[PDB]
Amino acid sequence: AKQSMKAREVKRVALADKYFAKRAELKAIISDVNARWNAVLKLQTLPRDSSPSRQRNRCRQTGRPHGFLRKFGLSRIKVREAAMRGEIPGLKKASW
Amino acid sequence: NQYYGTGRRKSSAARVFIKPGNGKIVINQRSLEQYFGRETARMVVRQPLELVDMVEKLDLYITVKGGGISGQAGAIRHGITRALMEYDESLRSELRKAGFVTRDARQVERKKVGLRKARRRPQFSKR
Amino acid sequence: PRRRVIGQRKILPDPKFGSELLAKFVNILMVDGKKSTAESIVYSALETLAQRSGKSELEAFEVALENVRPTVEVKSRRVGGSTYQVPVEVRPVRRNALAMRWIVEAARKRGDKSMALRLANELSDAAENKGTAVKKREDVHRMAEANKAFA
Amino acid sequence: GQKVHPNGIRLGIVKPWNSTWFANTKEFADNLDSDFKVRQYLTKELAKASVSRIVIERPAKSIRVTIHTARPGIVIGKKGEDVEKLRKVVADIAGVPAQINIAEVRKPELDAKLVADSITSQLERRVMFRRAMKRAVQNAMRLGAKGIKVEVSGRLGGAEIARTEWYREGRVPLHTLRADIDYNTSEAHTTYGVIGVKVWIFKGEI
Amino acid sequence: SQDGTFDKLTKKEALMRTRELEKLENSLGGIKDMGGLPDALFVIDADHEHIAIKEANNLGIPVFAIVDTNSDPDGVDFVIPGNDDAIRAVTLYLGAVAATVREGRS
Amino acid sequence: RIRIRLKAFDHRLIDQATAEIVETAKRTGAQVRGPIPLPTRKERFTVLISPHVNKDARDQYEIRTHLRLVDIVEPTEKTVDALMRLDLAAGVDVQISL
RNA sequence: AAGAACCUUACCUGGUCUUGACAUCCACGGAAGUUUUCAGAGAUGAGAAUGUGCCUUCGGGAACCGUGAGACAGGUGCUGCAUGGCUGUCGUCAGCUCGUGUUGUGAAAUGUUGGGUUAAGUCCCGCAACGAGCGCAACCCUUAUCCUUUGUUGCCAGCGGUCCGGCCGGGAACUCAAAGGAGACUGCCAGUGAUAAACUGGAGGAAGGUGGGGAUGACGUCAAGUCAUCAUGGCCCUUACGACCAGGGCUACACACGUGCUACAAUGGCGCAUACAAAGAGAAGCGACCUCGCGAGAGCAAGCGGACCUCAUAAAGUGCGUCGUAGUCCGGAUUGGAGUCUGCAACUCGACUCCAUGAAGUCGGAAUCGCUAGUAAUCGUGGAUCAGAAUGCCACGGUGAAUAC
Lengths: 96, 127, 151, 206, 106, 98
Ligand SMILES: [Mg+2]
Ligand SMILES: [Mg+2]
Ligand SMILES: [Mg+2]
Ligand SMILES: [Mg+2]
Ligand SMILES: [Mg+2]
Ligand SMILES: [Mg+2]
Ligand SMILES: [Mg+2]
Ligand SMILES: [Mg+2]
Ligand SMILES: [Mg+2]
Ligand SMILES: [Mg+2]
Ligand SMILES: [Mg+2]
Ligand SMILES: [Mg+2]
Ligand SMILES: [Mg+2]
Ligand SMILES: [Mg+2]
Ligand SMILES: [Mg+2]
Ligand SMILES: [Mg+2]
Ligand SMILES: [Mg+2]
Ligand SMILES: [Mg+2]
Ligand SMILES: [Mg+2]
Ligand SMILES: [Mg+2]
Ligand SMILES: [Mg+2]
Ligand SMILES: [Mg+2]
Ligand SMILES: [Mg+2]
Ligand SMILES: [Mg+2]
Ligand SMILES: [Mg+2]
Ligand SMILES: [Mg+2]
Ligand SMILES: [Mg+2]
Ligand SMILES: [Mg+2]
Ligand SMILES: [Mg+2]
Ligand SMILES: [Mg+2]
Ligand SMILES: [Mg+2]
Hints:
The structure is cut from a larger assembly and holds chains A, B, C, D, E and F. Chain A is mainly α. Chain A has one domain. In chain A, 38% of the residues lie in helices and 2% in strands. Chain A contains four helices and one strand. Chain C has one domain: Ribosomal Protein S7. In chain C, a hairpin with an 8-residue loop joins strand 1 and strand 2. The two termini of chain C are 24 Å apart. The chains are: A mainly alpha, B alpha+beta, C mainly alpha, D alpha+beta, E alpha/beta, F alpha+beta. Chains in contact: A-D, A-F, B-C, B-F, D-F. At the A-F interface, helix 4 and strand 1 of A face strand 2 and strand 3 of F. The structure holds one RNA strand. It is classed as ribosome. The organism of A is Escherichia coli. Chain B: 30S ribosomal protein S9.
C-alpha cells in the first residue's frame, strides 16, 4: 500500500530506537520534581521522528493502516485469509 | 448423621447440609433473617420445607457463592430439595408436583453481532 | 399464535398472602424490572386500604376488582369489507387482567404525593364506583351496548 | 459470496493445522511473519517442483519445515545438494538453525492444490478451458475421489463478459463437517486478465 | 438379513432396514435372479398390464396374454380370449401354462 | 518441589506430553504428585470479513491455551536427571522452575 | 475507520529533489559506525572530531555508506460495465437440478404431481417412472444432570488447638478447574390414524419430542459493493498524476435527514451505612501498600508473564434522614477562572479534575421501530483499536415482566 509509506515507517522505527529508549533520561529523569531550569526541555531538536508515538503500526504484508491487530501483526482481512488456510496456529471459528 | 445436596441456578452454586435437630437456620455464617430474611424471595428457601411440615425438626447449614440474590436463593432451594432425600424417596413424589427437583437451566443469552443485546435489534428506517 | 395453541407460564404466590392474583398485580405494577420496589408499593397501598375500609386486605382488593372487571368488550370483525366493531364476551383470566391494568393506569395518572397513596385512593374509590378505572369499565360497557346489533 | 472456507471450518474437526508451533504474544507476530516469509520463498523457488503444501513447526527452538511434493526426486536433486541449499537459505530467513523434510504425495491428481496448479498452468498455455476441467474431473474420479469438483471463473476464453461454468461428479457434502474435503485454489495470469480456479475433492466421510 | 449387519445399531435402524427390505422383495421379487432380458412375457390381464406389454413390444419380446372382452389386442403376439378376473379361471390358465413349462428341454 | 507447567494449543497433545512426564517420574522414583488441569484461556477475536463496508458481516475466532501442572515433590536424583531432555514437544511449551 | 493534534493523510498553501523515498545490476570512492558546530520552519547545505570490522593466484570481495549513466524505479491515477479474491441481499426461505426410461413433431413434460404428515422436496402410501446430486436433518462449539481421574495458586464437610483470617496442621469429601465417559432415542404406556407416516396425552427423568443458543447460507438474482487491503487486462503521468519537508484542512455552518447518550423526576434527587456477580487484560505492561493533594493526580516502591499479583470498591438493591410536586435539593447544556496527565507539541483540535455559572426540557403531531422468556426493560463490568481518546463496536453478568382469543 504505497510502499513509499512503508519506507517512511521503517525510517521512523530506525530513528525511534536509535535516539529514544536511551534518551528517555532527557525527558523523564530531568523534567522531574528535583526539589528549575528549562534547559533539558529546551533541548528537543531531535529529528522529531525519534518519538515512538509517530509509528502508525501498519500490517506486515499489505501495509494498510486500519483494522490492525497486535497479536498477529496483520490487518483484519489478511488475518482471515491466513487463518482459514492454517498458518496461524490454534485459530478456529469460535462459537458459544 | 448429616446429608448433602449441591443445588445450582443461574451462575449460582450452593452447598447444603441437613441434620435432624431443631429449626435453626444459617447461611454462609449468617442467618436467613440477616441474609435475605425480609427482602425479595424470602420464602423461596422455605418452600421445600413448608410442605412436609418443618415446625422445628431439621437443622440446616448451607453456603453459597456466585450470582445474585434471586439466583443464590434459587440455588439454595435446589440444594434443599436435593438434600431433603432424608425420608428416602417417599417425599420426592409430592416434591415433584411442587416442582423443585428440576434444575432450572435458563442462562442468559449471548449478545450476537449486529444486534444491540441478544435479541434487541437496532432501530430501522425504510425511506 | 399462527399455528401452535400455547400453554401458560406459572408465577410464585405473594409472599405475604400467597395469592397468585395479587402477585400478578404487583407484577403488572412493576417497571424496569424492580420487583422489590413494586411489592413495597403495593403492600403500603393495601394496608392503607385495609385500615381505611376496615375489613381485611383480600376482600378489600376483591371489591375493588369486581367493580372494574369488564364482562364484554368490543372488537373489530372486518369480514364483510367494512369496519364492524362487534361485542365479544371476555374470558375470566382476561377479565381481571384488564381490571388490574386499568387500576394501575388510573393510579399512575392521579396527582397525590406518593404512588402508594395513589393506589390507596384508587382502590378505595373503586369500591365506591367513582374512580377513573370504574369510568373506563362503564365506557367500555356502553360501547358494547351501542354495537349490540352485531353478533 | 456466501460460502465458508471448507478448510477453515474443518480446521479442528478433521483437517489438521498447517503450522503447529507455540508462542506467546511477545513473539507471535514475529513467528507468523517469518512463516509467511519462508513459505513464499519456497513456493517461488520450487515452482516447477509441484509442491502440495509446506508445514512449519518450531519445537524447542528450531524450525522443521516439511514439504509435501509429488516429485521429490528433483526437490531433493542428487543426494542432498539442492535440499541443503533450501535448508541453508531457510535458516538464514528464519534466523535459527533449520532442518527440512520431504513427504512424497501419492496420487498427485488427488491433491486439490496440485490439480489447480495443473489447470491454471494449462490455462496460461491457452488450452481450451472446458477440456482442461473435464480432464481433471475424469482422471480424478478414476482414482477413488468420491467427489471431485472444479470451477474456473473470470474472462473465460478471452471473452468480454466473465462467467464460471463449474463441473462436478460424485458427491461433495460441503455441509457435513466430518467429510474429508480437500479444497484449494489457484489463479492464472493470462493476457486477458486473471482467471481463478477452485477445486474440491471428497474422500472418506471420516 | 441373516449373516451380515442386521442387529447392530438402534432397533429403529433395524426396523427401517427390514421394512425397506420387504419393500424391495414385494416390489421386484422373483425377477431378482434373472440377469438379463427375458425371451417371452405372460400377462394375466392386457388392459391392466399395458405398460409391461408396451415395453415388451418396444424391445421386440414375444407377448402371450389373456385378453378379456374389455381388453385391447394388437400389442400381443399370442392372444388368449378368456376371463381374467375369476380366481378359478386364472388358476386354470396358470396351471396349464405351468404344466407345459415343467417339461423343459427334457 | 520441582514445578513443571506445560501449555499448548490442543488438549490431545498436552495430555500425552504430561502423561509422559508423570509416568517417567513415577517409574524413575516414587509418589510423583499428579498433573492438574487448572483453567484454560480463551482469547477471542472479531474481524470484518468484507473488504469494504458491510459492518454487520464479520466472523469470530478464538485461540484456546491449555495449561497443565505436575509439581513433582520428589527430589530424587534419578528423577531430576531424567526429567529434562524428555521434551517430545510438537508445539508445547515447558517451564522448569519451582 | 478496531479509534484525523504531528504522523496517520491521500487533500490545500508554500519551501524543495530528479535513475529518485523504495529494488537489481555496472563503474568509482569509502569500513560501518559514533560525538559535536553554523544557516534554515524543516527538508536540507556548510563544518569539525572519531572509528577503519571480516576476505585477498587480489579488473576485485561479501554485510554496509556516498558519486556517475543507463535499463528502470514510482502512482491511494481512470476503468468494480474488462477481471481474481472477498462481501451484502432475497434467505437458514425449502427449494434447485441431473442420468436412463417414457410422453410430445417441437419449445418441453414426467420424476419434483396426488392422499396424509412434518420446522423441512421430513416422512409414509400411491403413481411411467426408476435412481442420483446440491440443499433439510445429523456429524461440530457452548449450556443444563451425573460418574471416573488429578487436586494447585482452587476447596474446607468430619477432626486439634488458634491472633477468629482456610489461618494452621490436616483432609480428600464439597464447590470448582479440565480430560475421559453416561444421558434424550417417540424410548415406554394409553388413545387417534388404512392396521403406515405420524399426531395428542401420561409415567419416569436435570432435561421430551430438531431441550436452549451458536457456527453452518443450495442453483441463482441485483453488470449489487470493493481497481483504496491486495492481485490484475487496458489506458494514462514520468524535472511529475513520482519523492521530502513546515503549516493548515478532513473538526467549517443559514440549514435537511439517519443512528445514539442524557433528561424532563417522588417506582425519584441528595447524605450516611451496607450485601450479592460473570467474563477479560497485563512487560515500551498492569502497578498493591504508605505519604502528599479537596480533586484529576504526584512521590517512593512490592507483586505479577500471572486459578497466586494488579487492573478491581460492581451498580441497581436494602436500612435510616431530608427534599414535598416548584422549571424544584429535577436537568445538565453553555460560559469565566484555576488545574492533572499523555505527547517534541493540546490555538485551530485531547481527556479528565476543582470553584462559579445553571439553556432547552414538564413525556413529544402526522407517522414509525424492537421484542414471544431469562426475552423486552433496566443496572453495572471488561476487551480490541490505542502514547493520549467511546454516548460507537464486540463481549459479561445482576434484577426481571406484560401478552399471544
Ligand atoms: Mg503497490
Ligand atoms: Mg498513533
Ligand atoms: Mg443483560
Ligand atoms: Mg456467511
Ligand atoms: Mg489471564
Ligand atoms: Mg504534514
Ligand atoms: Mg494531518
Ligand atoms: Mg507543491
Ligand atoms: Mg459488480
Ligand atoms: Mg449492497
Ligand atoms: Mg421422441
Ligand atoms: Mg421444483
Ligand atoms: Mg418439472
Ligand atoms: Mg404432497
Ligand atoms: Mg431430502
Ligand atoms: Mg411420488
Ligand atoms: Mg476447627
Ligand atoms: Mg411428558
Ligand atoms: Mg444443517
Ligand atoms: Mg455497477
Ligand atoms: Mg461505486
Ligand atoms: Mg477510486
Ligand atoms: Mg469525517
Ligand atoms: Mg442536580
Ligand atoms: Mg460545579
Ligand atoms: Mg422553559
Ligand atoms: Mg413536575
Ligand atoms: Mg420468534
Ligand atoms: Mg449498558
Ligand atoms: Mg485495554
Ligand atoms: Mg486508549
